[PDB]
Amino acid sequence: ATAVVRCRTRLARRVVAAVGPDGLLPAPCESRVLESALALALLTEERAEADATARLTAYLRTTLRTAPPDPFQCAVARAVLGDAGTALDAGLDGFDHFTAGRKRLMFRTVLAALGATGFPAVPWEAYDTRPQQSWLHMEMKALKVLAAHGTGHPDVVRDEDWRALLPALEPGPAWECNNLAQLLALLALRHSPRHRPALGDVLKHVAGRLRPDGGMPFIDGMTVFTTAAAGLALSLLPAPPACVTPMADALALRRNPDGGYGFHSGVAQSDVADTCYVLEFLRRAAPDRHRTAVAEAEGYLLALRNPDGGFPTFARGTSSEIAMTAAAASALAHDPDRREEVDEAVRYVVRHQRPDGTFERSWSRNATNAVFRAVLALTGVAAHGEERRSRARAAERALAHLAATQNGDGGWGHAEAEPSDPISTAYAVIALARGPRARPGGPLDRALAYLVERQHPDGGYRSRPDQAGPRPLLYDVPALADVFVLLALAHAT
């Protein structure tokens, strides 16, 4: 067959082979400078785990020399190994997101907690946040506590502030698989005499999480998101492998009581991104076998829908997001009874397209992610008459943005002038596969050639990561590179 189909075949064999007999595709997160620095600061202050603190120090120095992250994370590591405001401004350089204000408060307080800068002179209510993702409440309370103690006003802390941190004292892996949240909570809790009896045992478990490279990962893993995305890719192949059934089973039995899905095993917080990938996959691979899970996931999404027609990530009443809205539109469009919500979601996407054809960055730090989600919703939901024209024009502007910013090597990076990476290019390919038929030398043709060229001898892909959290800080789940390139090649062939 073609080189693209040969490439797709080798990648599919590799992805199938990586799914375990439990139906899951393992998806560990790499060490990250931020969490490693916080783990270092916590263990150092507590004079615990000398072996672990030495490896963390070595990891941080090695990473800073050989693979330095964004300026904020570098400043954090330098603070702990020892222009903070300059690093904040550079790390949040034109971070254009509805959370920007919260993020500047958070990151500044992190740096101040580590002695790199002064604490923000804000009313304590600045740290108050409406209920959203479970662990976010804990992080904000931990930073409020650190600021109260750091500025010499410990009496400001109320019992309801401490109560928010109690999950950090539970044994075993971090609550909600989030090491950042537990590390921040523990840095705060070590200032409380009445919480100190529980600290010793958790510090031993923290220290036992170090990866072989001596670092601490952001999260314990991302196996639900990764397995669902890979199942979807595999289900779009001409003859899907048998393993889609155990993958569908493994996902369905992990559904949360609200009918949605978290990003990893043991994550009780559901989110629209995970849920939409699971729903799309189950719809194709197990619509009868898992009829009830499908219906519960649709019900989960509908109960999150915001009044403006968009969907938030975690909680109704937090800002709708374009990529989440497009994802939910595509995931809900399989039931003609949901057409009203689907159409309102697609209209939300069209209203929020930018004058240059783009949408926005959120959980992905490239522009191509939201383009691909938007284009799938704009072209996958059937529409006719005036509405067909409106959606086709918006999809055309998005695909034109892709063509206009395509790098000479045929790929795309995180931004118009960045070097190409396979993941960013994979998202663009999914979108462009909704455009005109590929032609020799055309944008889709060239993008597929780039992907063919970048395939490693072992059949896989190595890519700069695109996932951020907390936004805009990147974290690296290497398993996603193979999965999203496979999803692109499955869409494009």
Q: Which residues bind ligand FPP (CB under 6 A)?
A: 99, 133, 136, 178, 219, 225, 263, 271, 273-274, 313, 363, 467, 469-471
Strand partners, 318: 316
Q: Is 136 in the site for Mg ion (CB under 5 A)?
A: yes
d(Cα 467, Cα 423) in Å, to the nearest integer? 10
Residue 180 engages Mg ion in binding (rule: CB under 5 A): yes
Instruction: Kindly state whether residue 411 participates in binding Mg ion, applying the rule CB under 5 A.
Output: no
Question: How far apart are CB 287 and ligand FPP at their closest, in Å?
Answer: 23
Number of residues located near Mg ion, criterion CB under 5 A: 4
Q: CB of 255 within 8 A of CB of 296?
A: yes
- Closest distance to ligand FPP from the beta carbon of 221 (Å): 10
133 vs 227, which CB is nearer to ligand FPP? 133
Least distance to ligand FPP, CB of residue 317, Å: 14
Residue from the set 341, 470, 479, 493 that interacts with Mg ion by CB under 5 A: 470
Count of CB atoms within 10 A of residue 487's CB?
A: 24
d(CA 254, CA 262): 9
Query: Which candidate, 177, 257, 173, places its Cα nearest to that of 224?
Result: 177
**Quick one: tokens of 156?**
């400001």
* Residue 232 and residue 284 in contact, taking contact as beta carbons nearer than 8 Å: yes
Q: Binding partner of residue 471 among Mg ion, ligand FPP, none, CB under 5 to 8 Å per kind?
A: ligand FPP
In the bound state with ligand FPP, the residue whose beta carbon lies nearer, of 328 and 395, is 328
From the list ligand FPP, Mg ion, none, which binds 271 (C-beta under 5 to 8 Å, kind-based)? Answer: ligand FPP
Give buried/exposed letters for 394-420 (b at 16+ CB in 10 A, else e).
bbebbbebbbebbbeebbbbbeeebeb
- End-to-end CA, the chain: 11
Binding partner selected for residue 235 from ligand FPP, Mg ion, none, CB under the kind-specific 5 to 8 Å limit: none
**Least Å from the CB of residue 19 to Mg ion:** 28
Q: Which does 330 bind (CB under 5 to 8 A by kind): ligand FPP, Mg ion, none?
A: none
Residue 219 partner contact from Mg ion, ligand FPP, none using kind-dependent CB cut-offs of 5 to 8 Å: ligand FPP
What is the nearest approach in angstroms of Mg ion to the Cβ of residue 126? 15
| Rounded CA Rg of the chain | 23
Choosing among Mg ion, ligand FPP, none, which partner's interface includes residue 313 (Cβ < 5 to 8 Å by kind)? Answer: ligand FPP
Q: CB of 222 within 8 A of CB of 29?
A: yes
Q: Residue 467 binds what, of Mg ion, ligand FPP, none (CB under 5 to 8 Å, by partner type)?
A: ligand FPP
Nearest-angstrom CA–CA distance, 23 and 44: 40
- Single out the segment in contact with Mg ion by CB under 5 A; choices: 3-11, 63-71, 416-424, 464-472: 464-472
Question: What is the nearest approach in angstroms of ligand FPP to the Cβ of residue 472?
Answer: 8
State the amino acid at position 373 in one-letter form: R
Question: Using CB distances below 5 to 8 A depending on partner kind, what does residue 44 bind out of Mg ion, ligand FPP, none?
Answer: none
**Phi, psi at 474, each rounded to 5°:** -70, 145
Nearer to ligand FPP, 134 or 425 (CB): 134
Q: If 0-12 CB within 10 Å is exposed, 13-18 middle and 19+ buried, where does residue 151 land?
A: middle
Show Cβ contacts of residue 62 under 8 Å, excluding neighbours closer than 6 positions: 213, 214
Binding site for Mg ion (CB under 5 A): 136, 139, 180, 470
